[PDB]
Design a protein around this nucleic acid. Structure first.
Lengths: 65, 54
DNA sequence: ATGTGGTCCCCC
DNA sequence: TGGGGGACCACA
């Protein structure tokens, strides 16, 4: 579960995942972004990625199942 | 083009790039949950927070 | 040089 | 509407 050096004109790193290499961007539905950004602003974080870090740790106990 | 979304701080894009570290953990949750859309995993994550309500 | 976040215009 | 691929800007 690790990071993959970039191949072109982009130099962003992909990640190797359970299903293989994958880009680090995700699109959210309008339905879902509304609540995600509510979570991020409640925390005050400027970078989205730190909010999902926060969510993943809080969901730790429910992960591991 | 994809619509934006209005939030506590104005319009924001709905595509987020995650730090490689974060991206690895999240895609772990997604693939374990078996969801086809990353949103669904984000839904599931938010649902497991008694603590959004601090 | 080789990465970062975030977005730009394309495809399905 | 729902996605992602490749490129690009601006910054380490």
């Amino acid at each position: 579960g690790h990071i993959i050096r970039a191949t072109r004109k982009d130099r962003h790193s992909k990640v190797f995942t359970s299903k293989g290499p994958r880009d680090r961007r995700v699109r959210m539905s309008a339905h879902t972004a509304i609540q995600f950004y509510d979570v991020q602003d409640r925390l005050g974080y400027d970078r989205p990625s730190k909010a999902v870090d926060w969510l993943i740790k809080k969901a730790k106990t429910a992960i591991d199942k």
